[PDB]
mmCIF file of C-alpha atoms in Angstrom:
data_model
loop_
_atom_site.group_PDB
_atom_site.id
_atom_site.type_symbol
_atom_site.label_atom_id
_atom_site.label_comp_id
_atom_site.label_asym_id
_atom_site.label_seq_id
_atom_site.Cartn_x
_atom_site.Cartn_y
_atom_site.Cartn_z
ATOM 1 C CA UNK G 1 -5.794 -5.391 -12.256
ATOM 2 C CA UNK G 2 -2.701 -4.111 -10.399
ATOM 3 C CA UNK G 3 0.006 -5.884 -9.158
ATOM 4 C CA UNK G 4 2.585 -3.931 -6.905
ATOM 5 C CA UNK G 5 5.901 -5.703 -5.436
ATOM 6 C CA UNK G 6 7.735 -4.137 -2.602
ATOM 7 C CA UNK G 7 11.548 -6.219 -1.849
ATOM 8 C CA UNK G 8 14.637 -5.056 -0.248
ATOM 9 C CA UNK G 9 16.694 -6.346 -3.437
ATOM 10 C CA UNK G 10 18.058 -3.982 -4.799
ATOM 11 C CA UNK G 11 17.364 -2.025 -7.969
ATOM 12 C CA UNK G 12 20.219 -3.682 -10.178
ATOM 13 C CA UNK G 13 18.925 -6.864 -9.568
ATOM 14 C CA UNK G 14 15.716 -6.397 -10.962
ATOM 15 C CA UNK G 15 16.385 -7.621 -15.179
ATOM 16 C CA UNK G 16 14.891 -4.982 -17.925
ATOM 17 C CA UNK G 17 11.805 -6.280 -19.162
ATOM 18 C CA UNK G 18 10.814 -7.073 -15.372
ATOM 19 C CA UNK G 19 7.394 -5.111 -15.809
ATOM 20 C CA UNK G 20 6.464 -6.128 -19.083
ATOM 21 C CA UNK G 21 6.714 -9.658 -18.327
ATOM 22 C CA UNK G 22 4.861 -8.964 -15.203
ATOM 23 C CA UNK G 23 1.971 -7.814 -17.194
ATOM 24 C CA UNK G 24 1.893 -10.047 -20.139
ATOM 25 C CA UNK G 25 1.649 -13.236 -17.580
ATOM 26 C CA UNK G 26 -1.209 -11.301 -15.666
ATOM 27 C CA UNK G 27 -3.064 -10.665 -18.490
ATOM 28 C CA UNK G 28 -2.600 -14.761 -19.441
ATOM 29 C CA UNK G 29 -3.365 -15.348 -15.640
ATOM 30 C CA UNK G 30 -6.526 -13.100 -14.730
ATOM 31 C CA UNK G 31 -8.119 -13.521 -18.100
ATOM 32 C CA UNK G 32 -7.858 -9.544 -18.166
ATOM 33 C CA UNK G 33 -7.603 -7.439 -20.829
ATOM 34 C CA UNK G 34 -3.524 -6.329 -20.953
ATOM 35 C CA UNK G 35 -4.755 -2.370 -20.808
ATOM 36 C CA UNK G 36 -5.752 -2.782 -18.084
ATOM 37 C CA UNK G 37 -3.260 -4.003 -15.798
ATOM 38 C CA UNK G 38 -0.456 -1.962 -14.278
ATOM 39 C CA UNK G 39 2.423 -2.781 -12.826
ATOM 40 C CA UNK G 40 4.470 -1.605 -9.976
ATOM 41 C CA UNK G 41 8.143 -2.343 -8.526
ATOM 42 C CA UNK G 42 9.857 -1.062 -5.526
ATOM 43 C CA UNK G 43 13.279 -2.482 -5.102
ATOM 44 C CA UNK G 44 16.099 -0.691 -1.972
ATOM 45 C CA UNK G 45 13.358 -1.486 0.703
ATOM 46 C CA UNK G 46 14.164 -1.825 3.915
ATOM 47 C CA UNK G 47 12.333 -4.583 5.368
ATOM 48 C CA UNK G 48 12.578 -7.782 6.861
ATOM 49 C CA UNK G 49 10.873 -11.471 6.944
ATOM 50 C CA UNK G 50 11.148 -13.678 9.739
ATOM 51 C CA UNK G 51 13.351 -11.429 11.568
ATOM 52 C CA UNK G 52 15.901 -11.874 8.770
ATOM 53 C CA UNK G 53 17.203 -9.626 5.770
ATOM 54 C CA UNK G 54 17.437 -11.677 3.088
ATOM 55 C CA UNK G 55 15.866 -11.123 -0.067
ATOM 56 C CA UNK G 56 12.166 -10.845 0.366
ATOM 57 C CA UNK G 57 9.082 -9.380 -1.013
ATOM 58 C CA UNK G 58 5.679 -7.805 0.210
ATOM 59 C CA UNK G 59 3.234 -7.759 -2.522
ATOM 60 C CA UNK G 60 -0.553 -6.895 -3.386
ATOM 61 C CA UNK G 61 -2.665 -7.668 -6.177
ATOM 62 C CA UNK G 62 -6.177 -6.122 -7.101
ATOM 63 C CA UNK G 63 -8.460 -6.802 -9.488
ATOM 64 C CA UNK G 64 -12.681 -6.137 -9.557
ATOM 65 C CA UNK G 65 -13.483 -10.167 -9.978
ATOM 66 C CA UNK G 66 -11.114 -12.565 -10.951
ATOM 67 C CA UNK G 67 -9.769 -12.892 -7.020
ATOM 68 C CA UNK G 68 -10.827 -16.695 -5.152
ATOM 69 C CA UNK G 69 -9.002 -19.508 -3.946
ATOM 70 C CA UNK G 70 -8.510 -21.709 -6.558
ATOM 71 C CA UNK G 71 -7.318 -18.591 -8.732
ATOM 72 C CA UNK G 72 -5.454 -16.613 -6.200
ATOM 73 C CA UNK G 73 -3.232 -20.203 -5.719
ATOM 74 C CA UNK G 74 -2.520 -19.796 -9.415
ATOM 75 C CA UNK G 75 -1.459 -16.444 -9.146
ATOM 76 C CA UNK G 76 1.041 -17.143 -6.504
ATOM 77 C CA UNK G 77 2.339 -20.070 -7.928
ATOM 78 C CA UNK G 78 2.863 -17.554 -10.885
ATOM 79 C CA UNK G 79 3.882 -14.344 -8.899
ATOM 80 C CA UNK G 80 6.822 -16.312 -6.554
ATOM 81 C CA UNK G 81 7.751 -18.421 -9.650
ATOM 82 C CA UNK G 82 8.976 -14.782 -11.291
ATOM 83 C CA UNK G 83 9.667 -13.521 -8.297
ATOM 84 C CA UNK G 84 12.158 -16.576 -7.878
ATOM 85 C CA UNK G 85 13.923 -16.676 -11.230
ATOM 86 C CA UNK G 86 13.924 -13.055 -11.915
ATOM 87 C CA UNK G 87 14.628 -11.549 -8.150
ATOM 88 C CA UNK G 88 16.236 -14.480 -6.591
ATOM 89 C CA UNK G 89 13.565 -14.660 -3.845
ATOM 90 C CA UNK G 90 12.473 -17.591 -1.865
ATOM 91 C CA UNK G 91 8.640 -18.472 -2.092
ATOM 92 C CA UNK G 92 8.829 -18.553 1.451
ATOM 93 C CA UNK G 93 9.769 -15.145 2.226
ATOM 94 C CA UNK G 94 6.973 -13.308 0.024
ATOM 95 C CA UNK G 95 3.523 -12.228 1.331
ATOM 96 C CA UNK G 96 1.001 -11.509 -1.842
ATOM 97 C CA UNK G 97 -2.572 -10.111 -0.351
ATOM 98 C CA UNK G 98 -5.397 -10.801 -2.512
ATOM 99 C CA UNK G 99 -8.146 -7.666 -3.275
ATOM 100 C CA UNK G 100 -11.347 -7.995 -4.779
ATOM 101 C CA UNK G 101 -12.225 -4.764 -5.560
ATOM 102 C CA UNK G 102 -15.792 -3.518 -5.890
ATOM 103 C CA UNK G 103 -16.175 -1.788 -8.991
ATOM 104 C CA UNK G 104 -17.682 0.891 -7.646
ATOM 105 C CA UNK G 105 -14.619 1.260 -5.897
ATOM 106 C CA UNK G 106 -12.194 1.756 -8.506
ATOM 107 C CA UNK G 107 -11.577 5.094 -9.863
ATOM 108 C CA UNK G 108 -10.346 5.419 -13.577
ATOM 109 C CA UNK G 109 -10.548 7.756 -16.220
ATOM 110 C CA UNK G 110 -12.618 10.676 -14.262
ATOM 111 C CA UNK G 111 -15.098 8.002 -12.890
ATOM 112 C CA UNK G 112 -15.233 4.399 -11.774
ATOM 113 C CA UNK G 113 -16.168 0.754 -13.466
ATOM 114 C CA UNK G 114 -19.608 0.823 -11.906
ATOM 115 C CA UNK Y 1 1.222 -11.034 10.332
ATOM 116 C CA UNK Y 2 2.451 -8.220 7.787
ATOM 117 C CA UNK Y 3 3.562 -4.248 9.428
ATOM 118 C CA UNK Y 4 4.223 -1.063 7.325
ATOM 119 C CA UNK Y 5 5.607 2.272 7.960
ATOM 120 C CA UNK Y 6 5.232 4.859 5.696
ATOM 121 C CA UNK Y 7 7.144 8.383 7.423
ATOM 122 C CA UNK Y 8 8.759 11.621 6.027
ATOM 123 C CA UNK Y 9 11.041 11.094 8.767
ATOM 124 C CA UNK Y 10 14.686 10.610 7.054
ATOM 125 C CA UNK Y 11 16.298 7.823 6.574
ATOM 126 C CA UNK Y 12 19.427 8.713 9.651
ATOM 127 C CA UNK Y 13 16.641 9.177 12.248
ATOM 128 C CA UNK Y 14 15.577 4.976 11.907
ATOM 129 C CA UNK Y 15 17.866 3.403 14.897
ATOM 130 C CA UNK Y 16 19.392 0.200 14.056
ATOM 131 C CA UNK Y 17 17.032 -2.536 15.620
ATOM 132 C CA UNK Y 18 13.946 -1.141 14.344
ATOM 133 C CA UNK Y 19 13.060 -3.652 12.305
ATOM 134 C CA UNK Y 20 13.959 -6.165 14.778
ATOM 135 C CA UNK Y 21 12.394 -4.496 17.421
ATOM 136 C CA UNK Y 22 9.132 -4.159 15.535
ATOM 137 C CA UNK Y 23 9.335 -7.976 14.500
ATOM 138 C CA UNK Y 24 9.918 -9.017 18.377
ATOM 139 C CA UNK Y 25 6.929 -7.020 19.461
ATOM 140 C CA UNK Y 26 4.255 -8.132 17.469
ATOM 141 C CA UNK Y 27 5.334 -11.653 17.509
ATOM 142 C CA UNK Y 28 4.551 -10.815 20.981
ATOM 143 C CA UNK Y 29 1.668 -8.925 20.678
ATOM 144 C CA UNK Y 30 -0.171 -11.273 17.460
ATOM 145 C CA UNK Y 31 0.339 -14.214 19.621
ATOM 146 C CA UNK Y 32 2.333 -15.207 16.310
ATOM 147 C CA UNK Y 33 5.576 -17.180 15.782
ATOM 148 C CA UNK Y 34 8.115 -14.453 14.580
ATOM 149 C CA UNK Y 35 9.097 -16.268 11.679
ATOM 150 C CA UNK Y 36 5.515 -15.420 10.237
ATOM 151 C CA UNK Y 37 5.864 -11.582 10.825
ATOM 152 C CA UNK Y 38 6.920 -9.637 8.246
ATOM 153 C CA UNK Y 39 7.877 -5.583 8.363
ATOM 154 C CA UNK Y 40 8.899 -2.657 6.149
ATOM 155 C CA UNK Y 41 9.893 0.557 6.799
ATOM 156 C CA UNK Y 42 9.630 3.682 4.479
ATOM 157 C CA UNK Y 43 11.749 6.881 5.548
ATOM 158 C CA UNK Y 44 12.081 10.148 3.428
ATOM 159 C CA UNK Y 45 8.160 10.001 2.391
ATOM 160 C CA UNK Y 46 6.935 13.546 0.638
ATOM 161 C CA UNK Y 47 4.109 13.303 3.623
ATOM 162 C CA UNK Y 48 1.336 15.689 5.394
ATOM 163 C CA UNK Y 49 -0.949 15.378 8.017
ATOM 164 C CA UNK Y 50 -3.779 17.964 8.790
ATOM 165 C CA UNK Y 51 -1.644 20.121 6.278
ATOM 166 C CA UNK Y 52 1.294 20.140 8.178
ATOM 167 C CA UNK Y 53 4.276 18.572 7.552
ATOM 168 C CA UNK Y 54 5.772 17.953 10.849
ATOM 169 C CA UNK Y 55 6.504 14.006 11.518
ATOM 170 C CA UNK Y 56 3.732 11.592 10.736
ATOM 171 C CA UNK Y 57 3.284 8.035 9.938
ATOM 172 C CA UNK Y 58 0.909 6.285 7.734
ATOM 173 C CA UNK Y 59 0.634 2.289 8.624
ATOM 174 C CA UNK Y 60 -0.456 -1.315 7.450
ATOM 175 C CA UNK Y 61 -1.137 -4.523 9.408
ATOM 176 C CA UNK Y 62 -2.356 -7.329 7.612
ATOM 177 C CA UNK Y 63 -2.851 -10.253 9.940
ATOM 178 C CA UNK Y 64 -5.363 -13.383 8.945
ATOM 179 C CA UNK Y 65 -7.166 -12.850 12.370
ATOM 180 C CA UNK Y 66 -6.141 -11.527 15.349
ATOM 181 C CA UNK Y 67 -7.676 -8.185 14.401
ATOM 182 C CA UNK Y 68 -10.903 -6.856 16.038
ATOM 183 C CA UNK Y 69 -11.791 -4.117 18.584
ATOM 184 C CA UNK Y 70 -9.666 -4.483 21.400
ATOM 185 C CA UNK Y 71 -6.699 -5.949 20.228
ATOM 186 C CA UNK Y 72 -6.650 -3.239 17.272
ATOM 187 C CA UNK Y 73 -6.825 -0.776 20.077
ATOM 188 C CA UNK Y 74 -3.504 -2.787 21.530
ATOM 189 C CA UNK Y 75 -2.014 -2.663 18.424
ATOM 190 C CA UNK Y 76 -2.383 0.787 17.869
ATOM 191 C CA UNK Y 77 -1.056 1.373 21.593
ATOM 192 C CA UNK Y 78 2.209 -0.774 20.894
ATOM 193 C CA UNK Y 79 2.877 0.765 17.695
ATOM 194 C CA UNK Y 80 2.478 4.390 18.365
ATOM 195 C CA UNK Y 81 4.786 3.771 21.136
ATOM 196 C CA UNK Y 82 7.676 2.772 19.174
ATOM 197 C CA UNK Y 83 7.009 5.045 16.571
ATOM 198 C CA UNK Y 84 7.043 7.860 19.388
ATOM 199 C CA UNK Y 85 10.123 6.216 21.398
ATOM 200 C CA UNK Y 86 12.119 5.083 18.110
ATOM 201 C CA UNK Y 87 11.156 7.792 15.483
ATOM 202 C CA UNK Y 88 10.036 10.901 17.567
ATOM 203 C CA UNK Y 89 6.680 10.889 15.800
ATOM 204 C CA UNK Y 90 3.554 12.114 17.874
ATOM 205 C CA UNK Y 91 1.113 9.351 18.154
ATOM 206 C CA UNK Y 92 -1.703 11.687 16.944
ATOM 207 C CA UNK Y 93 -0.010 12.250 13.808
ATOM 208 C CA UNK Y 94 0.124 8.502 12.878
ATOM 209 C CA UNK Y 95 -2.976 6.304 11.357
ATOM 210 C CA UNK Y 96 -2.560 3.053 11.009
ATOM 211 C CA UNK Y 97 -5.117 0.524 8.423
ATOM 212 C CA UNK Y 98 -5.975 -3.248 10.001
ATOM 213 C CA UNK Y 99 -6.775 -5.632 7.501
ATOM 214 C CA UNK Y 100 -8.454 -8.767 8.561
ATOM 215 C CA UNK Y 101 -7.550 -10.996 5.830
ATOM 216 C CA UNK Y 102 -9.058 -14.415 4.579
ATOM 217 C CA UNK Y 103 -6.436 -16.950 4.181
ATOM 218 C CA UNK Y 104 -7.286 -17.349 1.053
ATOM 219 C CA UNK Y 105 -6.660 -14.403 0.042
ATOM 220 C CA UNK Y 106 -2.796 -14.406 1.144
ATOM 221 C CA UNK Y 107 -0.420 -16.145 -1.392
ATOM 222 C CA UNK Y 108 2.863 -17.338 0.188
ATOM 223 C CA UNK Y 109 5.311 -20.069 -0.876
ATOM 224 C CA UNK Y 110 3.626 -20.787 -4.413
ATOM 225 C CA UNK Y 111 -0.078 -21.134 -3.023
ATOM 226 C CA UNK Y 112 -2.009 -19.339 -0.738
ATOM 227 C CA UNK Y 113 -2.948 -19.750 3.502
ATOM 228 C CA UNK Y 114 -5.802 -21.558 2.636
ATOM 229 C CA UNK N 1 -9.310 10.590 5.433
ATOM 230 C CA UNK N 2 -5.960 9.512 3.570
ATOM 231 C CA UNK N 3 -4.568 9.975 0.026
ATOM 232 C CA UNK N 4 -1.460 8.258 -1.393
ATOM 233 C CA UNK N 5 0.047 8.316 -4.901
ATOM 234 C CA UNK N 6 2.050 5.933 -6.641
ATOM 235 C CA UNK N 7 3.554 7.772 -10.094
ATOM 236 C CA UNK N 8 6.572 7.275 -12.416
ATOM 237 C CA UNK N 9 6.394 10.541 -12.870
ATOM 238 C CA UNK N 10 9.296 12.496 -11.348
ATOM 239 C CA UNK N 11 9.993 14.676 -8.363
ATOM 240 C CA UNK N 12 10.634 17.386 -10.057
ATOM 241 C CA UNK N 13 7.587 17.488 -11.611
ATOM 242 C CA UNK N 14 5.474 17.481 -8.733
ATOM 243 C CA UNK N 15 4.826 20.898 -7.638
ATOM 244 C CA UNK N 16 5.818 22.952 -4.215
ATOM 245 C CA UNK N 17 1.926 23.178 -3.148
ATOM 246 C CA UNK N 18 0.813 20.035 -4.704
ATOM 247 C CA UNK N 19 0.295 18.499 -0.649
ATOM 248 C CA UNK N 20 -1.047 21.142 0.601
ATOM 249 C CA UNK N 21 -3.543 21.409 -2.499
ATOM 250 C CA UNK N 22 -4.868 17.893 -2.069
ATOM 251 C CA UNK N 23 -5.066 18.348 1.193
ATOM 252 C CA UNK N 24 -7.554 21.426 0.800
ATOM 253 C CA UNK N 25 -9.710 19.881 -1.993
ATOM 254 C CA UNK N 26 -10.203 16.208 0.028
ATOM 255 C CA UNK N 27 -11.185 18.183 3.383
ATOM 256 C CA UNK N 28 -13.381 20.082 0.870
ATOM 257 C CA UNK N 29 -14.692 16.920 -1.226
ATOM 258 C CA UNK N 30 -14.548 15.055 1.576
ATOM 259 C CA UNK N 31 -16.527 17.248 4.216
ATOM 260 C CA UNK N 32 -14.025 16.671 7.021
ATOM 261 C CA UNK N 33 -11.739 19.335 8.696
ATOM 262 C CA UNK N 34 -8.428 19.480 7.057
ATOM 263 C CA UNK N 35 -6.548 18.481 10.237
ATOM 264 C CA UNK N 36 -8.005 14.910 9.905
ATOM 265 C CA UNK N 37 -6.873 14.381 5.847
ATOM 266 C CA UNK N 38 -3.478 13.034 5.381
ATOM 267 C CA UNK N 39 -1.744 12.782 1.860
ATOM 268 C CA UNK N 40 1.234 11.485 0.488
ATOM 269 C CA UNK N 41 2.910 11.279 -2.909
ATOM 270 C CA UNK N 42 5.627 8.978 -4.073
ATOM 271 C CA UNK N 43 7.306 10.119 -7.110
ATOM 272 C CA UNK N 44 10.252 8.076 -9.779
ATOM 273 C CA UNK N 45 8.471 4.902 -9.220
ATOM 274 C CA UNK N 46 9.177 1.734 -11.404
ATOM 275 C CA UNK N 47 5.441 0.885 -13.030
ATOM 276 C CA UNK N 48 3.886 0.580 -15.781
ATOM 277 C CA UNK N 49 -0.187 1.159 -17.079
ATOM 278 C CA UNK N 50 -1.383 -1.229 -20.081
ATOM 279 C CA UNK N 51 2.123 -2.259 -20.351
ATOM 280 C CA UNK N 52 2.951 1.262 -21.269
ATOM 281 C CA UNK N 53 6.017 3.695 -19.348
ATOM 282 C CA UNK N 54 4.300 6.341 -19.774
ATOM 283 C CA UNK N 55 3.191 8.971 -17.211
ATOM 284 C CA UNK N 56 0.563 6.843 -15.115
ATOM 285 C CA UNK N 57 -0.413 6.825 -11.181
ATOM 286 C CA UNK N 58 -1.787 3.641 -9.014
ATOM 287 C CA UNK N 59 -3.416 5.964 -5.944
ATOM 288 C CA UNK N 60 -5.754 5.145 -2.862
ATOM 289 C CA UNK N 61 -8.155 6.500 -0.852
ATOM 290 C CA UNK N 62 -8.935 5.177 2.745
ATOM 291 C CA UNK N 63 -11.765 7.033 4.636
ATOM 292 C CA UNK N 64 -14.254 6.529 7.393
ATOM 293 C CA UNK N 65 -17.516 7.036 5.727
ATOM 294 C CA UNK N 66 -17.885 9.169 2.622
ATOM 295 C CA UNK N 67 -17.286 6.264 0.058
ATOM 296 C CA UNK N 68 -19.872 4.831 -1.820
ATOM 297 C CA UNK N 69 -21.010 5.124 -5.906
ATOM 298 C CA UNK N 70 -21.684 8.566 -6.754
ATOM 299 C CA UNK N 71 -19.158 10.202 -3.921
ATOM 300 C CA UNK N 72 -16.025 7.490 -5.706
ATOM 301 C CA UNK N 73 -17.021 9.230 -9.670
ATOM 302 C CA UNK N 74 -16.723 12.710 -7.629
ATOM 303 C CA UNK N 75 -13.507 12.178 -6.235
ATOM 304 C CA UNK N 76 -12.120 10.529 -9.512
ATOM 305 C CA UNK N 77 -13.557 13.686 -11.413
ATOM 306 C CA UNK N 78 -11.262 15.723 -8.614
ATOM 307 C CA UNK N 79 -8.515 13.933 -8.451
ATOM 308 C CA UNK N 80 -7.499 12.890 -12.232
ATOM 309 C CA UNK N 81 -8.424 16.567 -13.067
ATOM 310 C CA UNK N 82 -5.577 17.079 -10.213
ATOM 311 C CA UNK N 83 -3.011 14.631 -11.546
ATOM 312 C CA UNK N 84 -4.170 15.692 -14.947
ATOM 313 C CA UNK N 85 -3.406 19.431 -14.222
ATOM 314 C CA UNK N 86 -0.375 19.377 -11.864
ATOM 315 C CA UNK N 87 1.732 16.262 -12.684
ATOM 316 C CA UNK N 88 0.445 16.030 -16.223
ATOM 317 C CA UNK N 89 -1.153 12.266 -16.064
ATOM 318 C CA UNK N 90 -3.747 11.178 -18.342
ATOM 319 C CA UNK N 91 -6.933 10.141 -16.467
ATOM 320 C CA UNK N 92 -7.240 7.154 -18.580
ATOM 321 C CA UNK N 93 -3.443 5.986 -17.227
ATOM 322 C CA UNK N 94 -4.880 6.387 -13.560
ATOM 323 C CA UNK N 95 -6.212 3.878 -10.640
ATOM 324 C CA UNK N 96 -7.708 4.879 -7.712
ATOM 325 C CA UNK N 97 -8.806 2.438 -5.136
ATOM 326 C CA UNK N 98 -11.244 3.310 -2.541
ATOM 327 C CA UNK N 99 -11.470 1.955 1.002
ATOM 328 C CA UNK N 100 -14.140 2.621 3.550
ATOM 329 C CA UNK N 101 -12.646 1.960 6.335
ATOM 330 C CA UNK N 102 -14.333 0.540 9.824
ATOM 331 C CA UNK N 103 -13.375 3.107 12.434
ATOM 332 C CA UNK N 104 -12.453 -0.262 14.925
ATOM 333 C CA UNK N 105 -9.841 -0.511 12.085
ATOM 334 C CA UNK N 106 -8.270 2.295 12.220
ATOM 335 C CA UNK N 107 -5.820 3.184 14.221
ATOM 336 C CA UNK N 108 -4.587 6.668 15.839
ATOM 337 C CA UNK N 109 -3.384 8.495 18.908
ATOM 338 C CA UNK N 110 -2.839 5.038 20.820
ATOM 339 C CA UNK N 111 -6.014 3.539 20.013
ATOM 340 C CA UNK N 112 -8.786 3.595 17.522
ATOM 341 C CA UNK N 113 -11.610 5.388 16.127
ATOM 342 C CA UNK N 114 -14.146 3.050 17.725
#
């Protein structure tokens, strides 16, 4: 899986350990094993939700299987709960698309997971 | 609705409003309440397009409907606009990816649009 | 077609050519004239592969046409030897998701591909 957060907080804000906590609760959360799931944080951004510049996030998170409603809820609950006590961000001002990927269209290690 | 800008364009040549303006326009142009429109805007990108590396965008917008043939094609209309008026870059050297997405598939506020 | 990578590596270590190189070898792999191919690298990023800080990349590849199972192990066989060669990334620490894109949703030149 990857998980990528974009936010206009800004890089101070974001606690060490940020991206290892981020993976250890994916792996917990997808069922995945932890080598495979990276990580990815991009704090200064400018961007805006609502027409208004507080703190905020854009976010994605890919994975081949694993991705469905009832799952995809828990991940969110998950993702904004961090989000919230580690970034100070509102649930309410973070987007998180969803991406079942097709194995066949995941590249890794000089070939792909079909 | 979610809107992306990825430019080598620097960070000086964004004019204040942008982000406003983009927010105003596809409230307008999504048929969407404003408050559900979210943008970001990426300046100083290490960028090329057709192997030059004059001005150029590459863009995202996520919607959960209102994406389809003609209204893509209105999109794309809007958007290059601004990015022609506001950031001086040529519409032909600007793509721009529509995602349809399921509501399901979108988390926001500690569950998903579903 | 359009390339973007995500690395921790830094911008240093990305070399002078490295754009115009991927831009060559996707118009090549890709069979499309190199005006069409945009790339764009994003270097000093905050991520993490397998919970590990070292060198990785999280990449993408959006194209009309020319995705599918045996073309996706090509490219990943061109572009990790790429990564592996010029920014010194292990193919094993790099993603690459691939996107065939509907030409209705993709946008250019104040309209679409359709």
């Amino acid at each position: 899986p990857m998980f990528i957060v974009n936010t206009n907080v800004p890089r101070a804000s974001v606690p060490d350990g940020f991206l290892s906590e981020l993976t250890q609760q994916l792996a917990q959360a997808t069922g995945k094993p932890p080598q495979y799931i990276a990580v990815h944080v991009v704090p200064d951004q400018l961007m805006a939700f609502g027409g208004s510049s507080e703190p905020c996030a854009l976010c994605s998170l890919h994975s081949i299987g694993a991705i469905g409603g009832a799952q995809n809820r828990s991940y969110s609950k998950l993702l904004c709960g961090l989000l919230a006590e580690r970034l100070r961000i509102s649930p309410d001002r973070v987007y998180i698309n969803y991406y079942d990927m097709n194995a066949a269209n995941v590249g890794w290690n000089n070939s792909t997971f079909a």
